[PDB]
Amino acid sequence: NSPVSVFGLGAMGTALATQFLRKGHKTTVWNRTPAKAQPLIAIGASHAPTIDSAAAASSLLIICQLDKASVMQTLQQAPTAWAAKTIVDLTNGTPAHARETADWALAHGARYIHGGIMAVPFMIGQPDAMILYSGPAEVFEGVKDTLSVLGTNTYVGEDVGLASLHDLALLSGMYGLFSGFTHAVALVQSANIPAAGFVATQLIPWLTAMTQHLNLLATQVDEKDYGDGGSSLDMQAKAAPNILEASQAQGVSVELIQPIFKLIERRVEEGKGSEGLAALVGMIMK
Amino acid sequence: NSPVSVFGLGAMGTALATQFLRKGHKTTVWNRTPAKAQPLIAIGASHAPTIDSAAAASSLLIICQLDKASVMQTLQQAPTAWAAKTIVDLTNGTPAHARETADWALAHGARYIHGGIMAVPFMIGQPDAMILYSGPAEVFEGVKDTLSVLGTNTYVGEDVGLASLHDLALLSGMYGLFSGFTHAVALVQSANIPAAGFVATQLIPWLTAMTQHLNLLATQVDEKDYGDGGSSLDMQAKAAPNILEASQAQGVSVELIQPIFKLIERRVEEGKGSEGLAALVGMIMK
Ligand SMILES: NC(=O)C1=CN([C@@H]2O[C@H](COP(=O)(O)OP(=O)(O)OC[C@H]3O[C@@H](n4cnc5c(N)ncnc54)[C@H](OP(=O)(O)O)[C@@H]3O)[C@@H](O)[C@H]2O)C=CC1
Numbered sequence: 236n237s238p239v240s241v242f243g244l245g246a247m248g249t250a251l252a253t254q255f256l257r258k259g260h261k262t263t264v265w266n267r268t269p270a271k272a273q274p275l276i277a278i279g280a281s282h283a284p285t286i287d288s289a290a291a292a293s294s295l296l297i298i299c300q301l302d303k304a305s306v307m308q309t310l311q312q313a314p315t316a317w318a319a320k321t322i323v324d325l326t327n328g329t330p331a332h333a334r335e336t337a338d339w340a341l342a343h344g345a346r347y348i349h350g351g352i353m354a355v356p357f358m359i360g361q362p363d364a365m366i367l368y369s370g371p372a373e374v375f376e377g378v379k380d381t382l383s384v385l386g387t388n389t390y391v392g393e394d395v396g397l398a399s400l401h402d403l404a405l406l407s408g409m410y411g412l413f414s415g416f417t418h419a420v421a422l423v424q425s426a427n428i429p430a431a432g433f434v435a436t437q438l439i440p441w442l443t444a445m446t447q448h449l450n451l452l453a454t455q456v457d458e459k460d461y462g463d464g465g466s467s468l469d470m471q472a473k474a475a476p477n478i479l480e481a482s483q484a485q486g487v488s489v490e491l492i493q494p495i496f497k498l499i500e501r502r503v504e505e506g507k508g509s510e511g512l513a514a515l516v517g518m519i520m521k
Numbered sequence: 522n523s524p525v526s527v528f529g530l531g532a533m534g535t536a537l538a539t540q541f542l543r544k545g546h547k548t549t550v551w552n553r554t555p556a557k558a559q560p561l562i563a564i565g566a567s568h569a570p571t572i573d574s575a576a577a578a579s580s581l582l583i584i585c586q587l588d589k590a591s592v593m594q595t596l597q598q599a600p601t602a603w604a605a606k607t608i609v610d611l612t613n614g615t616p617a618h619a620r621e622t623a624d625w626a627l628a629h630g631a632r633y634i635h636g637g638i639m640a641v642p643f644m645i646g647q648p649d650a651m652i653l654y655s656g657p658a659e660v661f662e663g664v665k666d667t668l669s670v671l672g673t674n675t676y677v678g679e680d681v682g683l684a685s686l687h688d689l690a691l692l693s694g695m696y697g698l699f700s701g702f703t704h705a706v707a708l709v710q711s712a713n714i715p716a717a718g719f720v721a722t723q724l725i726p727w728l729t730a731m732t733q734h735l736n737l738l739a740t741q742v743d744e745k746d747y748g749d750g751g752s753s754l755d756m757q758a759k760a761a762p763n764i765l766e767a768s769q770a771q772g773v774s775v776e777l778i779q780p781i782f783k784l785i786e787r788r789v790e791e792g793k794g795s796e797g798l799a800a801l802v803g804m805i806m807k
């Protein structure tokens with residue numbers, strides 16, 4: 236159980252450090268605001284008094300702060316502390332941010348991989364958690380068994396920005412799901428329908444079926460052949476006004492769902508109403 | 522196996538009529554454009570020469586056309602044909618549309634229930650299909666065993682507009698899901714990543730986990746207590762710019778995902794960044 240250091244003790248960094256502790260690792264912790272270390276000290280963490288101390292304590296240095304600007308602030312406070320260490324940066328950012336941080340790390344003698352945590356904090360250490368990783372394969376292979384205590388490791392390749400592209404794509408997908416949740420639950424709550432009961436009984440099973448449907452849509456995207464699948468855009472463009480008008484009648488804003496209806500309408504206006512929803516991917520691409 | 526008539530032989534009405542035929546019902550079919558009956562004639566349907574003939578053939582009359590205006594056009598072509606028949610109207614519409622059509626039906630001597638088909642055509646007759654129904658319970662009970670061949674029957678109550686509210690809420694949820702799919706797949710395709718492979722391997726498992734998460738969100742909505750759940754809006758408002766900027770870098774429009782980020786930003790600006798996503802429901806409500 237190799238020593239690990241965690242920089243960033245917010246909700247997620249706390250979950251990561253806690254899981255290292257459960258798995259028997261000497262877990263050194265650092266946070267910009269030191270009071271946040273107290274809960275972790277109480278369950279066995281070693282609270283580093285400085286950035287340099289936290290870096291010195293371990294060879295595997297996990298950074299889970301806020302954004303890339305925050306990561307660079309921490310790295311630059313102790314520029315010589317990182318040499319011959321492996322930085323695993325789990326802080327949300329763009330592909331470009333990962334490449335920028337990697338360039339800095341390599342120039343300061345450190346090894347670097349970037350990862351994207353596909354979990355909320357309570358999922359860490361649980362079977363459904365997964366973390367995407369990218370950067371030099373030999374670097375990842377040196378730390379993958381320690382990192383595996385957090386979740387399933389999904390190494391996507393050598394390009395250090397690639398895990399971030401996968402991450403942000405998955406988050407995009409989730410934000411659409413949550414847009415749908417918000418709209419659906421506002422509509423039922425407008426009629427005093429139990430939200431949890433509706434969501435467990437009706438919404439989740441429907442979304443499960445329509446999630447499986449995404450396989451067919453994705454095949455159509457790859458084929459660039461946008462079959463209706465039995466559900467043409469012409470037909471959907473005549474249902475969309477009903478969803479909008481019913482929402483207006485219930486006092487529910489349509490802001491979260493209007494964009495896809497405008498895209499569907501545009502495809503109908505282009506003369507392609509006989510196609511299905513897989514057509515919409517290319518419509519938002521360059 | 523009681524005789525059934527189907528009005529509307531588009532993708533969905535064809536699927537409904539086909540399933541009645543497989544289950545041994547004398548299945549009478551009608552379509553505004555008569556050529557569309559030919560595939561169903563070939564597998565045993567009785568093609569009605571008129572609206573009145575189709576109504577006369579059965580006591581259970583299913584209407585699956587386009588919108589409420591279309592339903593009223595069919596009903597009004599033969600106003601005396603509906604007396605002492607049960608109309609099951611599966612044509613998409615608002616709660617108000619169902620109430621309007623029901624008022625007409627009752628004034629012309631017919632029984633009426635409205636339903637919302639939670640299925641695409643290939644799902645009809647399969648275990649995952651479900652149809653929502655509302656209107657007089659005694660009317661529904663008279664036809665529920667015949668209707669059960671199509672999917673699971675979910676009778677929601679006596680108010681004839683209620684199935685349509687549930688339907689449009691579920692469709693709203695699905696359109697958010699599909700917004701997420703579209704954005705996520707455009708981002709990976711911008712980097713030449715296989716769409717089907719990404720969706721099957723990464724997107725679907727992530728959406729499955731985040732769909733289960735909707736139970737927690739829904740409980741928080743019912744409680745009007747918008748705990749962060751480990752994922753505060755303040756934190757999400759610092760990730761959202763990364764998703765937007767990465768999308769811009771890949772040439773992908775952000776139109777489908779920008780609205781939820783604007784709502785998150787607004788909640789942070791209101792001083793409620795410490796809350797979680799369940800807060801967004803009330804934000805779009807009256
Ligand atoms: N929570 C979640 O569900 C998920 C989070 N993520 C990502 O994980 C990361 C952490 O999220 P989470 O823990 O929830 O966020 P929190 O808001 O709970 O914590 C943010 C952390 O970043 C630190 N930080 C902010 N600015 C700086 C700075 N300039 N220098 C040093 N440290 C700084 C904070 O320190 P201080 O205490 O001093 O403010 C704190 O440790 C983010 O990048 C997030 O996008 C990934 C997946 C899920």
Ligand SMILES: NC(=O)C1=CN([C@@H]2O[C@H](COP(=O)(O)OP(=O)(O)OC[C@H]3O[C@@H](n4cnc5c(N)ncnc54)[C@H](OP(=O)(O)O)[C@@H]3O)[C@@H](O)[C@H]2O)C=CC1
Pocket residue numbers: 465466467469470474528529530531532533534552553554557585586587588590591592594595611612613638639640641642
């Ligand atoms: N397909 C799907 O995935 C789903 C569809 N639905 C709903 O089911 C219904 C049917 O959808 P679907 O079959 O896919 O749509 P289609 O576009 O395939 O068929 C539309 C049907 O409506 C008929 N119609 C349109 N205008 C009129 C009119 N004025 N008078 C009489 N008939 C008319 C068409 O007749 P004609 O051939 O003469 O044009 C045709 O039979 C819609 O309300 C839809 O929202 C529900 C869930 C899923």
Ligand SMILES: O=C(c1ccccc1)C(F)F
Pocket residue numbers: 466470471474613640641692
């Ligand atoms: O638009 C509708 C739909 C589209 C795809 C799948 C399921 C339903 C609904 F109005 F028919």
Ligand SMILES: O=C(c1ccccc1)C(F)F
Pocket residue numbers: 327354355406752756757760
């Ligand atoms: O914003 C993020 C997130 C929010 C909820 C669930 C999972 C992830 C990510 F940037 F952290």
